[PDB]
């Protein structure tokens, strides 16, 4: 056991640019059409479409520089420190902003279904004013350690652009904060809100008129089903870095292949809002 080696598979240097280009194409068409239909021609009517517009804006921001990840998957990062920092900071702000928009979607659905009578002012207030200061401003202030720490390496091989940390404990606390911000706390909020939604909707089985819950339920379920195995992979990697799972270097190579492939497959939430807009599902 000399050290821990690094090796990327030759199939992941062709399949991952294919997946990145597919997601980039469907994201750029879908989010451009969604922006040009709702946010420009004033077509949006329901209260959740403002949140879907914000989600499509963050989705467009991630999709427009997904080609840099597509080039990085097969080539080396000859773009620079500025482009590496910018790609990382807008990937982080998109990945947190989409989660916070989905939490706000579930909160608006809870305020509309449970408080059906006395909630028209705070639904509109959540639609216009506090959504910025509760979704974007925590996301912009939560990505300044991504702004500081992310750099491009000057290693003679592969010129890697990644979030570079001083020691291995910083990787652990940042991955745990990544999990606790992306999956655990908003998943708890969304699950509790939807449990209260169904518990108060089963008391009102005598009238069945609204089915705007199905679209948001499908969107949230598809988002979490897309992002779940990447969170499992980074949780297993984080517990590997604690020297708890001492099951060999080959496990730490399989985990790092799984993380990359599953992150490429979990970028497929870019075609989730406009695909659900086209299908009306």
């Amino acid at each position: 056991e000399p050290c821990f080696r690094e090796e990327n598979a030759n199939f992941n240097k062709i399949f991952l640019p294919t997946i990145y280009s597919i997601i980039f194409l469907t994201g750029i068409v879908g989010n451009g059409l969604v922006i040009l239909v709702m946010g420009y021609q004033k077509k949006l009517r329901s209260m959740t479409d403002k949140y879907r517009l914000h989600l499509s804006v963050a989705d467009l921001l991630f999709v427009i520089t997904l080609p840099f990840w597509a080039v990085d998957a097969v080539a080396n990062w000859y773009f620079g420190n500025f482009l590496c920092k910018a790609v990382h900071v807008i990937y982080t702000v998109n990945l947190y902003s989409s989660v916070l928009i989905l939490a706000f979607i579930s909160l608006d659905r809870y305020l509309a279904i449970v408080h059906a009578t006395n909630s028209q002012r705070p639904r509109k207030l959540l639609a216009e004013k506090v959504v910025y200061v509760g979704v974007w401003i925590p996301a912009l202030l939560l990505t300044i350690p991504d702004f500081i720490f992310a750099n491009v390496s000057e290693a003679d091989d592969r010129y890697i652009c990644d979030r570079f940390y001083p020691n291995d404990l910083w990787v652990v606390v940042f991955q745990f904060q990544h999990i606790m911000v992306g999956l655990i706390l908003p998943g708890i909020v969304i699950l509790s809100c939807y449990c209260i939604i169904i518990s108060k909707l089963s008391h009102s089985k005598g009238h069945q008129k609204r089915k705007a819950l199905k679209t948001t339920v499908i969107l949230i379920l598809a988002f979490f089903a897309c992002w779940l195995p990447y969170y499992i992979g980074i949780s297993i990697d984080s517990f590997i870095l604690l020297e708890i799972i001492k099951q060999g270097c080959e496990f730490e190579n399989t985990v790092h292949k799984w993380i990359s492939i599953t992150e490429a497959l979990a970028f497929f939430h870019c075609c989730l809002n406009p695909i659900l807009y086209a299908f009306l599902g």
Partner: peptide, 20 residues
Amino acid sequence: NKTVLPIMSGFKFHSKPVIN
């Protein structure tokens, strides 16, 4: 003391040297 690439400790391409 066996060594590795020095300050490669991040989200990806992170390693760990072996002490003597």
